[PDB]
């Protein structure tokens, strides 16, 4: 809410100032198993999926 739009603007960004919308966050996921014999050994990768 707030801002009037109206025939107004070329700019994409001034509107992006707030589209409303939503922002970033982190989350922690699951425990881990070692591939072999130690977990400190193993390393992580996550592609988005």
């Amino acid at each position: 809410e707030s801002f009037q739009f109206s025939p107004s603007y070329v700019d994409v960004s001034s509107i992006s100032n707030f589209i409303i919308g939503e922002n970033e966050y982190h989350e922690i996921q699951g425990s881990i198993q070692q591939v072999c014999k130690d977990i400190n050994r193993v390393y992580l990768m996550e592609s988005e999926g």
Partner: protein, 51 residues
């Protein structure tokens, strides 16, 4: 904007010493609270009578 415009708004005597009497004669009657029934809807429909 809408296609209705003047360069600026705001102004006023402010007082209009007589005209204010009413206003004083009025607001003494006013409530910020809502009570009875029709007090509400008035104040209510002040919001989104558009809806």
């Amino acid at each position: 904007d809408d296609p209705d415009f003047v360069g600026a708004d705001g102004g006023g005597d402010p007082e209009d010493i007589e005209r204010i009497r009413e206003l004083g004669t009025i607001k003494r009657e006013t409530q910020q609270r809502c009570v009875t029934a029709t007090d509400y809807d008035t104040f209510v429909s002040e919001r989104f009578g558009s809806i």
